[PDB]
Amino acid sequence: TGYDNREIVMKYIHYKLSQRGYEWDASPVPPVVHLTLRQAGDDFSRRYRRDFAEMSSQLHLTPFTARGRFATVVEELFRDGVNWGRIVAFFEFGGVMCVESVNREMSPLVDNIALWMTEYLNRHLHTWIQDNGGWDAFVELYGPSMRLE
Amino acid sequence: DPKKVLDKAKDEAENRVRELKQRLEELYKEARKLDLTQEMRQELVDKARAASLQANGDIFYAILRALAEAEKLKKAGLVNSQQLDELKRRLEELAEEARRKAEKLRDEFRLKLEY
């Protein structure tokens, strides 16, 4: 059980891209999960924007390098555990690599990057998400921050 | 007392930065014993950026928890919508202060790496 993580990833990357004028075409999850995650992610990027900017500027990115870069970051991110904030950092990291890809005229890399996010979720984060109440726990944790906006 | 929520979140954030300093010292110590190429050095800088990402994640998470507590206080009537607005404001300046400190820790990691 729990929600389909491919769907979560697709909607999330789709929204990051369409919010920048790019149209990306490539158990069923409630709207509220999607909406909660795009808002927590936008909130994270607003606070930590300067850090991603320094990352993404210092990024030589090629179809053949991209996976290694993604791997190093997420390995260090989850080295000694998971929590919801690391998960949100994860999502926005993968979003920044997608946006950089379209910026550098390497749009087909967004499909690969969405695959890597999906496999990392399914293979490494899933059982921790489930043990900690699923994506519904996240919705509940972030609600108090939502109700301010 | 509404201030105590902000104080616990500060405590957590300041601890997490000290853990970061620690982690970047581990990273620098096991860089030192080796002797590096450009590829290897860029990898360490990237691990340092990822270690900061992680700290930022943890502090973001500490802030989600502070806001959830804040909401309970509001329901118990121990804080109001304005003080909750002030708390939000302080928690964002906090995130930025912690972020600035982590960046200084990075820049100093590199300066140590190369020189």
Residue numbers in the entry:
A (entry chain A): 7 to 32, 87 to 209
B (entry chain B): 3 to 117
Structure paper excerpt:
Pro-survival homologs (six in humans: Bcl-2, Bcl-xL, Bcl-w, Mcl-1, Bfl-1 and Bcl-B) are structurally similar, but oppose apoptosis by binding and inhibiting Bak and Bax, as well as sequestering pro-apoptotic BH3-only proteins (BOPs). Here we describe the computational design and experimental characterization of specific, high affinity protein inhibitors for all six pro-survival BCL2 homologs. As confirmed by biochemical analyses and X-ray crystal structures, the designed proteins engage the BH3-binding grooves of their specific target pro-survival BCL2 family members.
The SSM-guided mutation of 2-CDP06 core residue G107R is likely responsible, requiring the first and third helices of αBCL2 to shift relative to the BH3-mimetic helix and positioning the third helix much further from Bcl-2 than the αMCL1•Mcl-1 binding mode. The αBCL2 binding mode enables electrostatic interactions between αBCL2 R107 and Bcl-2 residues D111 and E114. SSM-guided αBCL2 mutation G107R contributes additional polar contacts with Bcl-2. Designed αBCL2 residue D47 is partially satisfied by Bcl-2 R129.
